[PDB]
Design a protein around this ligand. Structure first.
Ligand SMILES: OC[C@@H](O)[C@H](O)[C@@H](O)CO
Ligand SMILES: [Cl-]
Ligand SMILES: [Cl-]
Ligand SMILES: [Cl-]
Ligand SMILES: [Cl-]
Ligand SMILES: [Cl-]
Ligand SMILES: [Cl-]
Ligand SMILES: [Cl-]
Ligand SMILES: [Cl-]
Ligand SMILES: [Cl-]
Ligand SMILES: [Cl-]
Ligand SMILES: [Cl-]
Ligand SMILES: [Cl-]
Ligand SMILES: [Cl-]
Ligand SMILES: [Cl-]
Ligand SMILES: [Cl-]
Ligand SMILES: [Cl-]
Ligand SMILES: [Zn+2]
Ligand SMILES: [Zn+2]
Ligand SMILES: [Zn+2]
Ligand SMILES: [Zn+2]
Ligand SMILES: [Zn+2]
Ligand SMILES: [Zn+2]
Ligand SMILES: [Zn+2]
Ligand SMILES: [Zn+2]
Ligand SMILES: [Zn+2]
Ligand SMILES: [Zn+2]
Ligand SMILES: [Zn+2]
Length: 315
C-alpha cells in the first residue's frame, strides 16, 4: 500500500549490507521501497528528493551526502505534508520529520580509545576520514579529538579523506607510506572500508602487524577483527539501523505516535565478541533477517535501536 522513497549517498558496504534489512522490513509491512543512490553528489541527491516529492510518495528517507544541504527539498516535502527523515547521517535543516542517527561522536571516541589502548598511549598515527562535510567525518572527528586530548604522546602525522572507499584509502595510504614509512605506528580509519584499504597498502609495502581500527563491523571488517588484521571495530549493523529508520517512517505515514529521534549506539567489537557479530552479519544472516521485524518493533519501544544481543549490550 505505502510507497517510501530512499535516497542514499552511495551503495557503500554499510548501505549495501543494510539494504537487505530495510527491504525485509518493507516486505513485512506492505511498503514498496523506491531505492535511489546519489553517486556521492549533493545535486544528484537533491534531484532524487525532488522526483520523490513529485511522485507523491508517502515518505522519504535521506542518507545524506553533505550535512549542510537539501534545505529547499526538506522544506518542500514538509510544505506538502510528506514526512522526510534523515537516517544514518545528519542534516542541518530544522524541518525533518524524523532523525534516526548513530552517535558518531561516541564511535569516533571509541575507535580512538581502542588505538590508544593498543599503543599504550604512545605512537604516531594516521587518520582516514569519511567525505568532508558529512556528519560522519565531522562527528567521528570530534570524538577522535576528545580522546587525543588525553594523550600527549600520540601524534597524528596526517589526516585526509578517502570518502568511505577502500581503493581511495589504498592510494592515500600509499602516499603516506612513501612520506613517513615506519614512523607510522597505527591507522585510525573512520570506517572499516578505509581501514581495509590501508591494510592492503601496508601489505604491499611489506608491512605486517601495524594496528588498524575501524567503524561499522561490515563483513570484511568483522573478519579482520577475527584474524587480528584489525584491533577492533564498532558495530553499525545496517540491517538494524536502516530498518529502525524505516519503522519510524512507517509510523509517521500511519499517523502513529513514535519516538522520532532515536539514537543508535555502536557496541565495541573485539576478538572477545566478534563471533556473535559474525553470526548476525556474515554466517547466519538469513536467520538474523527472519528475526529482524520483531527486533525492530521491540527496540522501537525501548528506544535502544542498536540492541541485537551483542555481548556488552544492555541485557
Ligand atoms: O556517515 C554515513 C555512513 O554511512 C557511515 O555511517 C558509515 O560508517 C560509512 O561506512
Ligand atoms: Cl557488502
Ligand atoms: Cl534485499
Ligand atoms: Cl545475498
Ligand atoms: Cl527486496
Ligand atoms: Cl570510549
Ligand atoms: Cl568506555
Ligand atoms: Cl577497553
Ligand atoms: Cl613514536
Ligand atoms: Cl613507537
Ligand atoms: Cl587529528
Ligand atoms: Cl577492493
Ligand atoms: Cl584493487
Ligand atoms: Cl584493496
Ligand atoms: Cl563487506
Ligand atoms: Cl565500554
Ligand atoms: Cl542475503
Ligand atoms: Zn545477502
Ligand atoms: Zn531487496
Ligand atoms: Zn554522544
Ligand atoms: Zn567503552
Ligand atoms: Zn580500554
Ligand atoms: Zn612510534
Ligand atoms: Zn583532530
Ligand atoms: Zn581494492
Ligand atoms: Zn596494489
Ligand atoms: Zn559486506
Ligand atoms: Zn542499549
Amino acid at each position: 500500500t505505502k510507497r517510501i522513497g530512499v535516497t542514499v549517498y552511495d551503495m557503500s558496504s554499510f548501505i549495501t549490507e543494510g539494504k537487505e534489512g530495510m527491504d525485509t522490513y518493507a516486505k513485512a509491512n506492505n511498503i514498496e521501497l523506491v531505492w535511489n543512490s546519489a553517486n556521492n553528489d549533493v545535486s544528484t541527491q537533491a534531484s532524487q528528493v525532488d522526483s520523490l516529492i513529485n511522485q507523491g510518495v508517502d515518505a522519504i528517507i535521506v542518507v545524506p551526502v553533505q550535512a549542510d544541504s537539501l534545505g529547499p527539498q526538506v522544506a518542500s516535502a514538509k510544505s506538502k505534508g510528506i514526512p522526510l527523515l534523515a537516517v544514518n547521517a545528519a542534516l542541518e535543516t530544522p524541518d525533518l520529520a524524523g532523525n534516526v542517527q548513530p552517535d558518531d561522536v561516541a564511535a569516533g571516541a571509541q575507535e580512538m580509545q581502542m588505538m590508544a589502548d593498543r599503543l599504550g598511549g604512545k605512537g604516531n598515527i594516521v587518520i582516514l576520514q569519511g567525505p568532508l562535510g558529512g556528519s560522519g567525518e565531522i562527528n567521528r572527528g570530534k570524538g577522535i579529538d576528545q580522546v587525543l586530548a588525553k594523550y600527549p604522546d600520540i601524534k597524528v602525522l596526517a589526516k585526509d579523506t578517502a570518502n568511505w572507499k577502500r581503493d581511495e584509502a589504498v592510494n592515500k595510504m600509499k602516499n603516506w607510506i612513501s612520506s613517513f614509512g615506519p614512523q607510522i605506528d597505527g591507522v585510525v580509519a573512520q570506517n572499516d572500508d578505509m581501514g581495509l584499504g590501508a591494510l592492503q597498502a601496508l601489505k604491499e609495502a611489506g608491512r605486517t602487524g601495524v594496528p588498524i581500527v575501524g567503524i561499522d563491523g561490515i563483513e570484511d571488517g568483522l573478519n579482520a577483527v577475527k584474524s587480528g588484521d584489525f584491533i577492533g571495530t564498532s558495530l553499525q549493523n545496517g540491517t538494524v539501523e536502516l530498518s529502525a529508520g524505516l519503522a519510524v517512517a512507517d509510523a509517521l505515514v500511519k499517523g502513529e505516535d513514535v519516538k522520532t529521534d532515536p539514537v543508535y549506539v555502536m557496541p565495541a567489537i573485539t576478538k572477545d565478541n566478534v563471533d556473535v557479530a559474525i553470526e548476525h552479519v556474515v554466517t547466519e544472516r538469513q536467520k538474523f533477517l527472519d528475526g529482524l521485524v520483531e527486533l525492530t518493533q521491540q527496540n522501537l519501544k525501548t528506544g535502544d535501536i542498536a540492541y541485537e544481543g551483542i555481548p556488552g549490550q544492555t541485557q
